[PDB]
Amino acid sequence: EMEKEFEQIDKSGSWAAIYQDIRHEASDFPCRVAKLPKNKNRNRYRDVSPFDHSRIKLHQEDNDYINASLIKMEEAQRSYILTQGPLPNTCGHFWEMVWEQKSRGVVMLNRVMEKGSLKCAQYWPQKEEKEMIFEDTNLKLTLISEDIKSYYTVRQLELENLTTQETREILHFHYTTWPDFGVPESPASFLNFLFKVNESGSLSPEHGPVVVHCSAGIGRSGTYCLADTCLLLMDKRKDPSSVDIKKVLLEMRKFRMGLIQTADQLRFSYLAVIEGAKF
């Protein structure tokens, strides 16, 4: 039933037109805090900002700002923190947000360098013996182990609040073959990765929201979250065929701008939802 619409859009070739409709209809809320002069160096892209109403606030006293938004999908009963790839000066902020929000999983959908440009700082340690200290936010981060698969990596990190010596296990779910402004190589590989995240226990109701990021926290991250939310809704509605992926995406865009950055990412989200609804 959802693939009938999909086949019609494909036959008509109207993915670009459907996508531009969504861009035209999407919410426009203020981002005054993100645009304050004092926050210029905390934003990776001048055209990608969190709305004031949904931005994550840091709890230490001098500047509360991070480029991160809480997406609260009330009907699907899931919230996500979508954020940009941290900058070299915001890695301490990133881990402070992870600590304060009680998240236990971080989903990374990009590589640190893509097409020869830096897209995200090296915000976690690559070597067990070379831990990272974030002196500004009083946190230490140690690589405990990595489970490296052919197209993604799952890392066990230990995040320690150096003030209290409390430690927490953070799982890092790193999708390494998703090109910027592009799509996964198959719905099956995307779905197997999504299922690994969802079965990991990182998304339990006793924990804070999962953190999802790409370079900007909108294109790949929006594609991931739209598919995950729509699959939750289909497993949750009495009538699963009533799930309208365009309506869901517009709902998500009330909480962060620009979610899904190409018409092919929109097409892929439909495809992943169709394939996953079967499995």
Ligand X SMILES: O=C(O)C(=O)Nc1sc2c(c1C(=O)O)CCNC2
Q: Active-site residue numbers? A: 214
Confirm or deny that 136 is annotated as ligand binding: no
Give me the residues paired with residue 156 across strands.
145, 171
**Partner whose footprint covers residue 63, from ligand X, Cl ion, none (CB < 5 to 8 Å by kind):** Cl ion
Q: What is the C-alpha separation between 24 and 202, in angstroms, rounded?
A: 35
Confirm or deny that 217 is annotated as ligand binding: yes
Confirm or deny that 105 is annotated as ligand binding: no
Q: Which residue has its beta carbon closest to ligand X?
A: 219
Q: How far is the CB of 142 from ligand X (least distance, A)?
A: 27
DSSP code at position 1: -
Q: What are phi and psi of 125, to 5 degrees?
A: -80, 135
Q: What is the C-alpha separation between 52 and 56, in angstroms, rounded?
A: 9
Nearer to ligand X, 45 or 279 (CB): 45
Q: How far is the CB of 120 from ligand X (least distance, A)?
A: 8
For 157, the 3-state DSSP assignment is strand
Q: How far is the CB of 4 from Cl ion (least distance, A)?
A: 27
**Partner whose footprint covers residue 103, from Cl ion, ligand X, none (CB < 5 to 8 Å by kind):** none
**Partner whose footprint covers residue 143, from Cl ion, ligand X, none (CB < 5 to 8 Å by kind):** none
Supply the DSSP string of 242-268, one letter for each residue. G--HHHHHHHHTTTSTT-S-SHHHHHH
**Partner whose footprint covers residue 220, from ligand X, Cl ion, none (CB < 5 to 8 Å by kind):** ligand X
For 140, the 3-state DSSP assignment is strand
Query: Quick one: which of 181, 155, 183, 185 has its CA closest to 170?
Result: 155
Positions touching Cl ion (CB under 5 A) are: 23, 36-38, 63, 111-112, 258
Confirm or deny that 56 is annotated as ligand binding: no
Distances (CA, A) of 265 to 158, 243, 260: 33, 18, 6
Confirm or deny that 215 is annotated as ligand binding: yes
Q: What is the C-alpha separation between 270 and 7, in angstroms, rounded?
A: 11
Positions touching ligand X (CB under 6 A) are: 45, 47-48, 110, 119, 180, 214-216, 218-220, 261
Q: How far is the CB of 214 from ligand X (least distance, A)?
A: 3
Nearer to ligand X, 160 or 228 (CB): 228
Nearer to ligand X, 11 or 24 (CB): 24
Nearer to ligand X, 220 or 267 (CB): 220
Torsion of CA 94, 95, 98, 99, to 10 degrees: -140
State which H helix or E strand residue 159 sits in. strand 152-161
Q: Which residues are annotated as a binding site for substrate?
A: 180, 214-220, 261
> Binding site: what residues are annotated?
180, 214-220, 261
